[PDB]
RNA sequence: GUGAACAGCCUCUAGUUGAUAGAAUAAUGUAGAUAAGGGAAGUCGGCAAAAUAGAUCCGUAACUUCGGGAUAAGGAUUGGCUCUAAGGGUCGGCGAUCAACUU
RNA sequence: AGCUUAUCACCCCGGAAUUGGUUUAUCCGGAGAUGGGGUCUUAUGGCUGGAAGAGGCCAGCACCUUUGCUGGCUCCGGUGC
RNA sequence: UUCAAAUGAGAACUUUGAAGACUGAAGUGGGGAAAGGUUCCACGUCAACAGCAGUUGGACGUGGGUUAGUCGAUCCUAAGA
């Protein structure tokens, strides 16, 4: 016999590929009688043709390795194979840093912790460097305000 | 017997290829479960009726 | 192709209607010289332009 | 195969930790090799010579980066105990036991802390100059 | 397809004289997250569009069913 | 709280299953905040003979219950003939496969 | 998934399992691979092969159309596991809360 | 399909050096900034209608069918060079 | 590449199942343009062809099959004729 058409039709009906669908070799004449998708559906429901659930692709190992990376492993020079820039652009780092410094100064000026003139000079100093992060900027602000009230 | 179970499941599984068929859809004989449950130590007088 | 012109499709239809063997009731005729179709065509052997 | 064949040739043979033990044992030996007059052929022109890893570096900073490394610590953790001579190899088989045991107690008493103090002086000398 | 809020315009649509068919749909829904209740959708088939009215309260819904005209065909579920 | 309800009539009648051993397995192998031995006022496993019942205030799920029950069936060599299924929400039951003569 | 990466290696979905077969394992070949000690004595000719190779750090000459040469050259390292520090956002008149991989 | 929603752009008030606002990238302002309020394009997203009645996932039950019919679920989120 | 069964006079090569592998999303996948023109699909089916074989086939014999106000041509003009 030749159940090629039947395998094709069963795949097209169930909505999978032919690599999945399964024909019990005992009901060969009953399958060969079928030449229609309605008959193939009958054979699907009665239990003559089934679906063959998916071949697995587990991610336990990937999740474990990722967890170790979060914990700070597998990162040394023997694992690094691209440049520091290709791994993380200095442009991206500088963008983050400068957005942060601009946002902080905006919030301080709007709250009233600082005036617009000191805001203006700090804006351009943070556009340049000499403010490496939030901590340094806050400390410089404190020094400025303290010497101002001292004057 | 534990080693025998492992050796049996090694042949039975073949899991990295083709995703073992579900038992929902398959059908088994009667006589097979007779032997299985007799080996387990049950009796089939309640199943023979059926 | 698949966006043919009707001229090409008409020629194709003629070719399909020609693509046959010879009928058997012509073998049985008085003074029959014809034994096969010598103008037979197949898509793979000869192209019809 | 090729890796072992082309690393561990007798041409490219290194300096047999027994001798490094015997060299780090005494004061004069370590001071001689720290001094090491200017030789035109040696890599670092003499100076910058690690004794544990019997190796000439080019410069002081190359010595620093060598010492801040696991290749150095491999050797220092290999050189702490006794040096495994033929005495050990035959005392294991039942041959000149008393010589081996005298050598062992000799190292445990005399030569051990001698070399340890020499290593400590070496380390603080190098860390202070570098 | 179009939604309606008012009731007067739904009655006008039922009496528009180009409507032949309507249908009532019942759905079980949860309010906010909380309690089951019975939403009703009264759809009427115009020529160009399908107009629909959403009624949450079944009491007003069945009175709407009563006030529907009699010649209009209706389909339940 | 949350209630889950297993039925064991089918196998127990034909004599392959005892609900008391199943509950004795569950009550010890159920985990809370780590390992065995923390079912303090949180969980209550109780049988009737035809129906086993679980009541949990802690983290517990039908998939966890199915996992435990399948483990018990594999222990007693019943995985290849019986399946744990849901008939209604949080109402499960054991059922034989489609064995025909 | 590894990794800078649509590279190379493995896998999921989908597809294929097509290319005349069987038995032995001689030489000569075709495609590869290893070899003591010596290391270009080979050969027209170091042809071919080998060696080097990624990333971090140090360091980098003559000459120069001053822009380059330059990855010049030459050197120290690279695993795994347990930790430390630093690098942010949202709300509250310093705290509560949340989150990523980079060093 | 209905309602709503945006960067740029524009309008009203007001009149700026102790010059200010501001992009990752430095440009804008008496030819009227910052600030306050408002208008517009509706690509794009959100809600509703379409539309759950569909589809999907399960459980069954007729077993004599070359179509046999019922029941449940289909929810709420999070994150990024 | 292999194992059993089925079919058949006959199976290393066909069908199903059971295994083992491969392409490895810049595919041995899913769709299209030019070109081809029924090679698509089904039923029978082995004389010749498929550099072995053949129960199989893009072969042989006979049929079926391509549904548009919204996809295209059609219309516009481009270099040009
Ligand atoms: Zn050393």
Curated annotation (Swiss-Prot), chain A:
GO terms for molecular function: RNA binding; structural constituent of ribosome. It is found in: Cytoplasm. Component of the large ribosomal subunit (LSU). Mature yeast ribosomes consist of a small (40S) and a large (60S) subunit. The 40S small subunit contains 1 molecule of ribosomal RNA (18S rRNA) and 33 different proteins (encoded by 57 genes). The large 60S subunit contains 3 rRNA molecules (25S, 5.8S and 5S rRNA) and 46 different proteins (encoded by 81 genes). eL19 lies in close proximity to the binding site for eukaryotic initiation factor eIF4G. The modification Phosphoserine is found at residues 29, 36, 90. Its main location: cytoplasm. Keywords: Cytoplasm, Isopeptide bond, Phosphoprotein, Ribonucleoprotein, Ribosomal protein, Ubl conjugation. Transmembrane segments: none annotated. Belongs to the eukaryotic ribosomal protein eL19 family. It comes from Saccharomyces cerevisiae (strain ATCC 204508 / S288c). There is a cross-link at residues 20, 52, 59, 145 (Glycyl lysine isopeptide (Lys-Gly) (interchain with G-Cter in ubiquitin)). The keyword Repeat does not apply. Present with 97700 molecules/cell in log phase SD medium. It comes from the Eukaryota. The gene is RPL19A. Residues 58-67 have a biased composition (Basic residues). Residues 57-84 are annotated as: Disordered. This is Large ribosomal subunit protein eL19A. GO terms for cellular component: cytosol; cytosolic large ribosomal subunit. GO terms for biological process: cytoplasmic translation.
Swiss-Prot record, chain C:
Residues 6-19 have a biased composition (Basic residues). Keywords: Cytoplasm, Ribonucleoprotein, Ribosomal protein. Transmembrane segments: none annotated. It is found in: Cytoplasm. Coiled coil: none annotated. Residues 1-21 are annotated as: Disordered. The keyword Disulfide bond does not apply. The keyword Lyase does not apply. Its main location: cytoplasm. InterPro entries: Ribosomal_eL39 (IPR000077), Ribosomal_eL39_CS (IPR020083), Ribosomal_eL39_dom_sf (IPR023626). GO terms for molecular function: structural constituent of ribosome. One of its GO terms (biological process) is cytoplasmic translation. GO terms for cellular component: cytoplasm; cytosol; cytosolic large ribosomal subunit. Component of the ribosome, a large ribonucleoprotein complex responsible for the synthesis of proteins in the cell. The small ribosomal subunit (SSU) binds messenger RNAs (mRNAs) and translates the encoded message by selecting cognate aminoacyl-transfer RNA (tRNA) molecules. The large subunit (LSU) contains the ribosomal catalytic site termed the peptidyl transferase center (PTC), which catalyzes the formation of peptide bonds, thereby polymerizing the amino acids delivered by tRNAs into a polypeptide chain. Belongs to the eukaryotic ribosomal protein eL39 family. Component of the large ribosomal subunit (LSU). Mature yeast ribosomes consist of a small (40S) and a large (60S) subunit. The 40S small subunit contains 1 molecule of ribosomal RNA (18S rRNA) and 33 different proteins (encoded by 57 genes). The large 60S subunit contains 3 rRNA molecules (25S, 5.8S and 5S rRNA) and 46 different proteins (encoded by 81 genes). eL39 interacts with YIH1. The gene is RPL39.
Curated annotation (Swiss-Prot), chain E:
It comes from the Eukaryota. The lineage of its organism: Eukaryota, Fungi, Dikarya, Ascomycota, Saccharomycotina. GO terms for biological process: cytoplasmic translation; protein-RNA complex assembly. Gene3D superfamilies: 3.30.720.90. Component of the large ribosomal subunit (LSU). Mature yeast ribosomes consist of a small (40S) and a large (60S) subunit. The 40S small subunit contains 1 molecule of ribosomal RNA (18S rRNA) and 33 different proteins (encoded by 57 genes). The large 60S subunit contains 3 rRNA molecules (25S, 5.8S and 5S rRNA) and 46 different proteins (encoded by 81 genes). This is Large ribosomal subunit protein eL38. One of its GO terms (molecular function) is structural constituent of ribosome. Signal peptide: none annotated. Disulfide bonds: none annotated. Present with 50200 molecules/cell in log phase SD medium. GO terms for cellular component: cytoplasm; cytosol; cytosolic large ribosomal subunit. It is found in: Cytoplasm. InterPro entries: Ribosomal_eL38, Ribosomal_eL38_sf. Keywords: Cytoplasm, Ribonucleoprotein, Ribosomal protein. Belongs to the eukaryotic ribosomal protein eL38 family. The keyword Ribonucleoprotein applies. The keyword Ribosomal protein applies.
Curated annotation (Swiss-Prot), chain F:
It is found in: Cytoplasm. Keywords: Cytoplasm, Ribonucleoprotein, Ribosomal protein. It comes from the Eukaryota. Coiled coil: none annotated. GO terms for molecular function: RNA binding; structural constituent of ribosome. Its main location: cytoplasm. One of its GO terms (biological process) is cytoplasmic translation. GO terms for cellular component: cytosol; cytosolic large ribosomal subunit. Component of the large ribosomal subunit (LSU). Mature yeast ribosomes consist of a small (40S) and a large (60S) subunit. The 40S small subunit contains 1 molecule of ribosomal RNA (18S rRNA) and 33 different proteins (encoded by 57 genes). The large 60S subunit contains 3 rRNA molecules (25S, 5.8S and 5S rRNA) and 46 different proteins (encoded by 81 genes). Present with 60400 molecules/cell in log phase SD medium. There are 2 genes for eL22 in yeast. Component of the ribosome, a large ribonucleoprotein complex responsible for the synthesis of proteins in the cell. The small ribosomal subunit (SSU) binds messenger RNAs (mRNAs) and translates the encoded message by selecting cognate aminoacyl-transfer RNA (tRNA) molecules. The large subunit (LSU) contains the ribosomal catalytic site termed the peptidyl transferase center (PTC), which catalyzes the formation of peptide bonds, thereby polymerizing the amino acids delivered by tRNAs into a polypeptide chain. Belongs to the eukaryotic ribosomal protein eL22 family. The chain holds residues 12 to 112 of 121 of the full protein.
């Amino acid at each position: 016999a030749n159940l090629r058409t039947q395998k094709r039709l069963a795949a097209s009906v169930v909505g999978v590929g032919k690599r999945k669908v399964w024909l019990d070799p005992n009901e060969t004449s009953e399958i060969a009688q079928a030449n229609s998708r309605n008959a193939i559906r009958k054979l699907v429901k009665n239990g003559t043709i089934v679906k063959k659930a998916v071949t697995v692709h587990s991610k336990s190992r990937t999740r474990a390795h990722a967890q170790s990376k979060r914990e700070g492993r597998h990162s040394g020079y023997g694992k690094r194979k691209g440049t520091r820039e290709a791994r993380l652009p200095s442009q991206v780092v500088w963008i983050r840093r400068l957005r942060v410094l601009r946002r902080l100064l905006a919030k301080y000026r709007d709250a009233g912790k600082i005036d617009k003139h000191l805001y203006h000079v700090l804006y351009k100093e943070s556009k340049g460097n000499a403010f490496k992060h939030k901590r340094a900027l806050v400390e410089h602000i404190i020094q400025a305000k303290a010497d101002a009230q001292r004057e | 017997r534990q080693k025998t179970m492992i050796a049996e499941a090694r042949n039975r599984k073949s899991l990295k290829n083709k995703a073992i068929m579900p038992r929902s859809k398959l059908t088994k004989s009667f006589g097979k479960m007779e032997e299985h449950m007799s080996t387990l130590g049950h009796d089939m007088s309640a199943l023979q009726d059926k | 192709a698949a966006q043919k012109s009707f001229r090409i499709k008409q020629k194709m239809a003629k070719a399909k209607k020609q693509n046959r063997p010879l009928p058997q009731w012509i073998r049985l005729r008085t003074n029959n010289t014809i034994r096969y179709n010598a103008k037979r065509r197949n898509w793979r052997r000869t192209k019809m332009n | 195969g090729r890796y072992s064949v082309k690393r561990y040739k007798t041409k490219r043979r290194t300096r047999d930790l027994d001798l490094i033990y015997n060299d780090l044992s005494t004061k004069e030996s370590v001071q001689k090799l720290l001094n090491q007059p200017l030789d035109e052929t040696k890599p670092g022109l003499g100076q910058h010579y690690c004794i544990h890893c019997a190796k000439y570096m080019e410069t002081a900073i190359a010595l620093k980066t060598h010492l801040k490394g696991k290749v150095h610590k491999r050797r220092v953790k290999e050189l702490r105990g006794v040096p495994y001579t033929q005495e050990v190899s035959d005392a294991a088989a039942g041959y000149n036991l008393n010589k081996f045991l005298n050598r062992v107690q000799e190292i445990t008493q005399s030569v051990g802390p001698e070399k340890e103090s020499n290593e400590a002086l070496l380390k603080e000398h190098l860390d202070s100059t570098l | 397809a179009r939604e309606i809020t008012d009731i007067k315009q739904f009655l006008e649509l039922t009496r528009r004289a180009d409507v032949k068919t309507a249908t009532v749909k019942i759905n079980k829904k949860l309010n906010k997250a909380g309690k089951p209740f019975r939403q009703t959708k009264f759809k009427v088939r115009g020529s160009s569009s399908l107009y629909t009215l959403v009624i949450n309260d079944a009491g007003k819904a069945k009175k709407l069913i009563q006030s529907l005209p009699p010649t209009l065909k209706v389909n339940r579920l | 709280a949350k209630t889950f309800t297993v039925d064991v009539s089918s196998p127990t009648e034909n004599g392959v299953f005892d609900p008391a051993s199943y509950a004795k397995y569950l009550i010890d192998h159920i985990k809370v905040e780590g390992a065995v031995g923390n079912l303090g006022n949180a969980v209550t496993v109780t049988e009737d003979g035809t129906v086993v019942t679980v009541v949990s205030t802690a983290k517990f799920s039908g998939k966890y219950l199915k996992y435990l029950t399948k483990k018990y069936l594999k222990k007693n060599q019943l995985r290849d003939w019986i399946r744990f299924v849901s008939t209604k929400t949080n109402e499960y039951r054991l059922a034989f496969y489609q064995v025909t003569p």
